[PDB]
Amino acid sequence: GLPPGPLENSSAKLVNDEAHPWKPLRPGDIRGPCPGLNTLASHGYLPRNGVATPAQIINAVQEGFNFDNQAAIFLTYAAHLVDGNLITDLLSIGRKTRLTGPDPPPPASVGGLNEHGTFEGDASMTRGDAFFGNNHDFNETLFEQLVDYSNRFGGGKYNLTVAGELRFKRIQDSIATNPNFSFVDFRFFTAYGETTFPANLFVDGRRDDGQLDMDAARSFFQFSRMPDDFFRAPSPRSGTGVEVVVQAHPMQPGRNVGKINSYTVDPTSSDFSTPCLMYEKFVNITVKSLYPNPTVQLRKALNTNLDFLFQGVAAGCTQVFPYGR
Numbered sequence: 001g002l003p004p005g006p007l008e009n010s011s012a013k014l015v016n017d018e019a020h021p022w023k024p025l026r027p028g029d030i031r032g033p034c035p036g037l038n039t040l041a042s043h044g045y046l047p048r049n050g051v052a053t054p055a056q057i058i059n060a061v062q063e064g065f066n067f068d069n070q071a072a073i074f075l076t077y078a079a080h081l082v083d084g085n086l087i088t089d090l091l092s093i094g095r096k097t098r099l100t101g102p103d104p105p106p107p108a109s110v111g112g113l114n115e116h117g118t119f120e121g122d123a124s125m126t127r128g129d130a131f132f133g134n135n136h137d138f139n140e141t142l143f144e145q146l147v148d149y150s151n152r153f154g155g156g157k158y159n160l161t162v163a164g165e166l167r168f169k170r171i172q173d174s175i176a177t178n179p180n181f182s183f184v185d186f187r188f189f190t191a192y193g194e195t196t197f198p199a200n201l202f203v204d205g206r207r208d209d210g211q212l213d214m215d216a217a218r219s220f221f222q223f224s225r226m227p228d229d230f231f232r233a234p235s236p237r238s239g240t241g242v243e244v245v246v247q248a249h250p251m252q253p254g255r256n257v258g259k260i261n262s263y264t265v266d267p268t269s270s271d272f273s274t275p276c277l278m279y280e281k282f283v284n285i286t287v288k289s290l291y292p293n294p295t296v297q298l299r300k301a302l303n304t305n306l307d308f309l310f311q312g313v314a315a316g317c318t319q320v321f322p323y324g325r
């Protein structure tokens with residue numbers, strides 16, 4: 001289906017309401033590395049089994065959290081192109097599942113949001129690096145480090161100042177311990193934006209003061225659960241304040257080169273000075289590598305989802321056509 005448009009009414013409102021109660025997981029229900037999508041699934045804004053269409057994800061992030069339309073389109077179609085089934089139009093918000101339907105040929109993985117190095121990647125705040133065995137489950141030790149950083153830099157709340165310090169701490173922890181640490185291109189961009197989302201979208205919309213309390217933080221990050229009486233944000237937003245997080249500790253894109261403490265800058269990577277290059281590499285290298293020579297029906301589904309992705313790309317970038325027009 002076509003990407004949904006913006007909300008007709010973007011006011012703050014109760015989203016933890018009678019039609020969207022929290023429920024625990026049933027056998028087979030899928031949760032993944034994103035506390036936002038996990039919460040929408042666990043309140044029935046998404047299918048509770050954690051398998052959804054791109055149109056369902058965009059409608060859910062808008063309706064439940066007031067995620068802005070352009071950000072919703074960009075992230076949802078990027079995730080879907082690399083992790084979703086383009087023929088069935090289904091994406092797992094976590095593990096690979098037969099529920100997304102018959103797989104395309106390799107090297108396409110259709111691995112769900114849990115797939116390392118497509119969307120998901122290293123130096124997550126509350127999830128471990130894939131090298132350490134689990135890139136998707138809530139991690140109590142890492143959450144307690146978020147709490148400690150909130151206590152030291154946020155007077156006990158998570159805010160953009162905390163985000164700037166913890167983002168850097170998590171990068172330095174991956175450099176020191178993950179010999180395969182990768183922090184380039186799409187992950188370099190998304191890792192900074194994600195640190196703003198708790199301050200912008202998990203804060204009750206009646207306050208909208210960017211100060212997330214640790215009870216609410218644990219409820220979203222661990223239990224995929226809105227606070228009792230949670231109001232969504234009072235206007236559409238996604239990553240506003242990311243400039244504060246970058247400014248705290250500016251980093252160049254790079255990777256460890258098969259050993260700890262070997263962080264080597266990659267001059268072929270996009271960075272914040274080359275946002276259009278991030279889009280071009282994502283399509284020309286990442287998507288094309290999964291679907292190098294697609295059959296007629298896949299090519300058509302790729303071209304449709306690539307058009308939708310471009311709708312979420314900031315004005316002033318040129319659309320690229322890896323399978324022609």
Ligand code: HEM
Binds near residue numbers: 126
């Ligand atoms: C619109 C579509 C969305 C997609 C496709 C998506 C996908 C993802 C993925 C794959 C990750 C894992 C990246 C990583 O840390 O390795 C992630 C992280 C995250 N997402 Fe989402 N997300 C979306 C929307 C949102 C929304 C609406 C929120 C909040 C309301 C949100 C909050 C987060 C947070 C806080 C993290 C970081 C978790 C951490 O580092 O501990 N996302 N998202």
Ligand SMILES: CCCCCC/C=C\CCCCCCCC(=O)O
Binds near residue numbers: 071189194238278314
């Ligand atoms: C734009 C904020 C920088 C980092 C935050 C994570 C990335 C995406 C948030 C939504 C922006 C969607 C369009 C970006 C434009 C582009 O891809 O060139």
Ligand SMILES: *[C@@H]1O[C@H](CO)[C@@H](O)[C@H](O)[C@H]1NC(C)=O
Binds near residue numbers: 009012013
């Ligand atoms: C918009 O939503 C608000 C509360 O969420 C409500 O008070 C108002 O009546 C709504 N506007 C329309 C167009 O219905």
Ligand SMILES: *[C@@H]1O[C@H](CO)[C@@H](O)[C@H](O)[C@H]1NC(C)=O
Binds near residue numbers: 116130131132182
């Ligand atoms: C290691 O990094 C490579 C790409 O640099 C990636 O393909 C691979 O999945 C990573 N593995 C883990 C578990 O980090």
Ligand SMILES: *[C@@H]1O[C@H](CO)[C@@H](O)[C@H](O)[C@H]1NC(C)=O
Binds near residue numbers: 128140141142
């Ligand atoms: C959580 O993260 C810590 C710190 O990186 C790690 O040592 C631990 O093995 C992870 N897993 C669990 C289940 O706590």
Ligand SMILES: *[C@@H]1O[C@H](CO)[C@@H](O)[C@H](O)[C@H]1NC(C)=O
Binds near residue numbers: 153154161
């Ligand atoms: C985070 O909270 C601390 C303590 O209240 C404060 O000094 C700092 O200015 C806050 N930062 C933001 C961006 O709100």
Ligand SMILES: *[C@@H]1O[C@H](CO)[C@@H](O)[C@H](O)[C@H]1NC(C)=O
Binds near residue numbers: 280281284320321322
């Ligand atoms: C992507 O491929 C297009 C041609 O399809 C080309 O114009 C563009 O320069 C490429 N961008 C890269 C590799 O960054």
Ligand SMILES: [Cl-]
Binds near residue numbers: 070
């Ligand atoms: Cl919007």
Ligand SMILES: [Mg+2]
Binds near residue numbers: 033120121122124128
């Ligand atoms: Mg991760």
